[PDB]
Amino acid sequence: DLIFCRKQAGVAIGRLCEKCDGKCVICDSYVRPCTLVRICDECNYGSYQGRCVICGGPGVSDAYYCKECTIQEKDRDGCPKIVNL
Amino acid sequence: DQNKLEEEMRKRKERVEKWREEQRKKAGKKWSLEDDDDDEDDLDPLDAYMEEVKEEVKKFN
Amino acid sequence: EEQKERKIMKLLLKIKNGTPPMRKAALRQITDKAREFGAGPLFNQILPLLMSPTLEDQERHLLVKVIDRILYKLDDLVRPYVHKILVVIEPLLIDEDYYARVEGREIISNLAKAAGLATMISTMRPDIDNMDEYVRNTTARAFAVVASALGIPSLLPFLKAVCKSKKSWQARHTGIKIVQQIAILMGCAILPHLRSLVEIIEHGLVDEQQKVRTISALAIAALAEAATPYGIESFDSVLKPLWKGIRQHRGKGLAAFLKAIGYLIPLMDAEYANYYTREVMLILIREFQSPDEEMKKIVLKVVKQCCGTDGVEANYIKTEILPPFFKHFWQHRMALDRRNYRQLVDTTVELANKVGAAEIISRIVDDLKDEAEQYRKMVMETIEKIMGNLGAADIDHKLEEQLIDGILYAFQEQTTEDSVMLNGFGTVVNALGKRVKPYLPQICGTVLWRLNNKSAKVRQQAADLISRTAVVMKTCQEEKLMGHLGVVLYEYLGEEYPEVLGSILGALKAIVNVIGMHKMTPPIKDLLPRLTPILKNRHEKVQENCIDLVGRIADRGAEYVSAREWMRICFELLELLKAHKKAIRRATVNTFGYIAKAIGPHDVLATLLNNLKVQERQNRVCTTVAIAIVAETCSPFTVLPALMNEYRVPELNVQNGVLKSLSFLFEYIGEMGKDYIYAVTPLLEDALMDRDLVHRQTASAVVQHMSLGVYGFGCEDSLNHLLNYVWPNVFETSPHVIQAVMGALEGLRVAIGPCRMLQYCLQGLFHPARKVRDVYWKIYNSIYIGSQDALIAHYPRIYNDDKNTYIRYELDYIL
Amino acid sequence: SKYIGTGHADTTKWEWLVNQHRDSYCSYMGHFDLLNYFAIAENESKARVRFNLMEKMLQPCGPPAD
Ligand SMILES: CC[C@H](O)[C@@H](C)[C@H]1O[C@@H]1C[C@@](C)(O)/C=C/C=C(\C)[C@H]1OC(=O)C[C@H](O)CC[C@@](C)(O)[C@@H](OC(=O)N2CCN(C3CCCCCC3)CC2)/C=C/[C@@H]1C
Ligand SMILES: [Zn+2]
Ligand SMILES: [Zn+2]
Ligand SMILES: [Zn+2]
């Protein structure tokens, strides 16, 4: 049930927690963070305002795509928030 | 060295106090804009327009 | 049947405690169901559940969305219930929770759109004249929400009528409050209707009732704040009454009128701004002496607003405004007053930002020596803010002497360790720069006295000060009692408090990082063996600072300690690449790079290969990272032969480690790999011909990282050669192998181009077997989603049949 | 599957060919110098070529089978 949200991303910036701080959301790499992550409006609302996009804990820093995912334009899909059903 | 550091502090404190002594010799009702509470002290165009509206609502019903 | 529809509209429980798929399913079905259910039962049940005392936030959000959707469909049937809904949701608009307010406003907006304007007005009009002040506020906020939903000109007639009511002053008050709430809620969207609203509310400034005048002034201030920096022609019929009122009024109404003046002044030109400032300024100077504190806050805000415009120049300010300001506001009574303290600091900083730093700084710097420490911290805060915003250029000899003496006396006279004095000292010294030569002996004596003893909470603050000021400490060409300080910091290396040890290590690092290893007193061959046992401490600040210090030492003083101890230190650092914290990992990477650059790649690489052979998973992964680091700092030419010689061992689990190391190496070096693709190609061939599955999976990962690493560098020959060996693995059922194969194919799509991939897919797209078709259409869809545009030039020609035309004729044109 | 133009093991020749014709026409509308080439080749105004391509967008390759 690890599925990405894949909704139209807005102006909200994705956040990472203390455990996931250096990670890439899509491929889980740690090398060369390149592009700032954007999330949709339903992922950024109320109690969901600041939360890790990978796990859902309290965010502390910005989420980034890696250079490898940026080269393949994998930052052009929807909201990359991990959502469980 | 520690004794010298302690001395330097003592002298600075003494100089400040002397300067101060030298100077000294030379020399509510509560209200809020968030309330309408006034302090102590104490045909029509609204009905006509209301009558025009009431007429519209009655006609629709 | 009645409870029929109730039992079936328990759909809202289907949604409340339910799964997301059935959530949206029941949402859609209840949306289709709403018009037939009827608003009566639906609301009769939902408004209690929304009135539930312990509902959640997102449950409330989903309920609000349900309301939105069931309100859109049933449009004109909601009228007979509007009143009821309002009594439930006219609260939630003055709630201290922001999202509760957003949800209430959204609900009222959808309700106003569902119903009509006449219905909302007819249900909301009786509570316009109410005496309970709690109702007249929610009514005004709801009218503002309705105006924001249905538009301003649709409500303009009702407004124009209600604030001309001669029946009662409560109706006029509530109408003007509606205009004010409309401004507050809509912001800069009121600009096309500014003059209409202003002419609707302008006659209240001269009312016989004092509450109407106050609310009119507050509404004018709200409109002027929403309009900035545009709109002054629309505020023209208010300039005369407002100023006559500030000349005649006194008290609460005077405060409202002054707030209005202050919000209106920044909209004028230099002439009017300059002319109007003089008038309101004599009035404000008179009002400086007021006992009330709300009045003081308003006066400070107006002074800050007016002194920030162009029509007011520094001459008039220093001549008329500064003497009374500094005579009336700068007393410790202001310091214990926590309400207006920040306001005073901001007003003073923004005054200095126009009149010049020297005058403000002097007038308050004589006050740095004071019996009260609250008044000391206030002055220090203001001074360091001004210093950070403008600097110390026009500060002169007398002012410099006074500043230094004051900050020194304030540092020593300190009860509790505060960040205020620390930051003030730091920024003052940093702004003075190379100018403070003798106060450098003085400051060194002061920090020596503070660092000598007293509970290590003063010592850690002194260490922070050293860490932040050592740059200007040494750049002034002074190094000796710098070493005297370093000796004491060294002696303060055994500390039970990790917080103080972190600051000590930071100060030591800032010293050794700024003074040269040359001619410096505390020997490195003494500091480093004393330093290596601290690397095993478990505090984050201690660990980070220790790693940074060892890194600096290895970068500059590498020739002072044997290579064996460096090897031990790097083997110990190996375990810190697993840290849960990012700063620890960053510093560890840096320090490992420095140590590898220092002692040479050969021995560390031999040790790392031995360690990769014999350990558990996480340690082997960290060893792989370490090999990649060594190969990046010392060119991969020095690592690749020894790593490829290890693939020659005839034993599995050794070759797989070499392959994982090559994978991470290429991923880590990226563009640097363009010179090394020819060297690893036969090894990847061998690994791709192997029967072992991990061999082929890891070789595919290597191919992917190598492909994405070299892109635009002309390495297509080897990549096509390797694709010839990767492609036969598309008929693999193992999930990990096929995942790696797909990754490698999508990397080759970028490095090699989509034309080659389409050429590999063409003959299988229409194969008779369904397995081949499934695999090839998956690959083709992956190629098509990325670079759909390039494929236009690559499609093969397909001839027309009898029924259909397939040739693209435009591309056959020949100019 | 949600992206328009992708295929699967049951895709026919007609669907494939109309997909590539449709995105060919869109690529012609997008690129400024391809439309120049066509408008010089057939001696028409560029607005006319654009309108002709939009009109051809509806049913390229003729109506489907059976
Ligand atoms: C197979 C590898 C493993 O997945 C491993 C990375 C990781 O899974 C383990 C778990 C764990 C916690 O032990 C380690 C995780 C991550 C690391 C050790 C990375 O470091 C960090 O997290 C710290 C932080 O994210 C930044 C580190 C940094 C800058 O070195 C990062 O690499 C880079 O950004 N590089 C490496 C490439 N380098 C060159 C230099 C030229 C221009 C920039 C790009 C190319 C620039 C700097 C990765 C390092 C560690 C793998
Ligand atoms: Zn990535
Ligand atoms: Zn997390
Ligand atoms: Zn999302």
mmCIF file of C-alpha atoms in Angstrom, chain A residues 18-23 27 29-33 41-42 44-49 61-62 66 68-69 71-73 77 84-85, chain C residues 19-21 57-58 61 65 99 102-103 106 580-582 585 664 667-671 704-705 708-709 711 743 746-747 749-750:
data_model
loop_
_atom_site.group_PDB
_atom_site.id
_atom_site.type_symbol
_atom_site.label_atom_id
_atom_site.label_comp_id
_atom_site.label_asym_id
_atom_site.label_seq_id
_atom_site.Cartn_x
_atom_site.Cartn_y
_atom_site.Cartn_z
ATOM 1 C CA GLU A 18 15.162 13.795 11.262
ATOM 2 C CA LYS A 19 15.374 10.161 10.134
ATOM 3 C CA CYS A 20 14.743 10.787 6.411
ATOM 4 C CA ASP A 21 16.590 14.109 6.161
ATOM 5 C CA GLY A 22 19.016 13.281 3.354
ATOM 6 C CA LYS A 23 16.811 10.865 1.410
ATOM 7 C CA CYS A 27 14.477 6.307 -5.336
ATOM 8 C CA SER A 29 19.215 7.725 -2.809
ATOM 9 C CA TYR A 30 21.416 9.998 -0.698
ATOM 10 C CA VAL A 31 23.671 11.475 -3.420
ATOM 11 C CA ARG A 32 23.301 14.939 -4.996
ATOM 12 C CA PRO A 33 19.912 16.401 -3.987
ATOM 13 C CA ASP A 41 -3.032 21.074 -1.257
ATOM 14 C CA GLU A 42 -4.748 18.077 0.364
ATOM 15 C CA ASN A 44 -0.678 20.308 3.082
ATOM 16 C CA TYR A 45 -3.693 21.129 5.233
ATOM 17 C CA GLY A 46 -4.528 21.415 8.914
ATOM 18 C CA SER A 47 -2.742 18.689 10.843
ATOM 19 C CA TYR A 48 -0.931 17.628 7.656
ATOM 20 C CA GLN A 49 0.823 20.996 7.316
ATOM 21 C CA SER A 61 13.951 20.204 6.550
ATOM 22 C CA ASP A 62 13.188 20.380 2.837
ATOM 23 C CA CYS A 66 18.106 13.623 -6.675
ATOM 24 C CA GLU A 68 19.334 11.158 -11.238
ATOM 25 C CA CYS A 69 15.558 11.577 -10.888
ATOM 26 C CA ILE A 71 17.585 14.045 -15.340
ATOM 27 C CA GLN A 72 14.807 11.530 -16.100
ATOM 28 C CA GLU A 73 12.120 14.167 -15.347
ATOM 29 C CA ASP A 77 4.621 13.576 -11.999
ATOM 30 C CA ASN A 84 -1.334 4.444 2.681
ATOM 31 C CA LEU A 85 -4.816 3.017 2.182
ATOM 32 C CA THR C 19 -11.581 3.380 4.030
ATOM 33 C CA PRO C 20 -10.548 5.981 1.401
ATOM 34 C CA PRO C 21 -11.945 4.010 -1.578
ATOM 35 C CA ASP C 57 -9.732 18.075 12.412
ATOM 36 C CA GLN C 58 -9.747 15.975 9.241
ATOM 37 C CA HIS C 61 -12.650 18.681 6.842
ATOM 38 C CA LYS C 65 -16.558 18.710 1.877
ATOM 39 C CA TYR C 99 -8.670 26.071 10.169
ATOM 40 C CA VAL C 102 -11.535 28.601 7.181
ATOM 41 C CA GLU C 103 -14.020 25.716 7.330
ATOM 42 C CA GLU C 106 -16.243 27.868 3.302
ATOM 43 C CA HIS C 580 20.800 8.941 12.055
ATOM 44 C CA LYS C 581 21.762 12.633 11.732
ATOM 45 C CA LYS C 582 22.735 14.398 8.515
ATOM 46 C CA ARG C 585 27.339 12.075 8.053
ATOM 47 C CA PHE C 664 27.910 3.045 -5.959
ATOM 48 C CA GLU C 667 26.606 6.713 -9.046
ATOM 49 C CA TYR C 668 28.786 8.830 -6.748
ATOM 50 C CA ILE C 669 31.307 10.146 -9.281
ATOM 51 C CA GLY C 670 28.803 10.902 -12.042
ATOM 52 C CA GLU C 671 30.486 12.954 -14.762
ATOM 53 C CA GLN C 704 22.045 2.408 -15.140
ATOM 54 C CA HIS C 705 24.283 4.568 -12.948
ATOM 55 C CA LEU C 708 22.969 8.504 -16.227
ATOM 56 C CA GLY C 709 26.462 9.597 -15.189
ATOM 57 C CA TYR C 711 25.224 11.994 -20.802
ATOM 58 C CA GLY C 743 16.077 0.891 -14.406
ATOM 59 C CA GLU C 746 15.367 3.898 -18.618
ATOM 60 C CA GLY C 747 18.917 5.111 -18.035
ATOM 61 C CA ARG C 749 16.844 5.828 -22.862
ATOM 62 C CA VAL C 750 18.504 9.054 -21.716
#
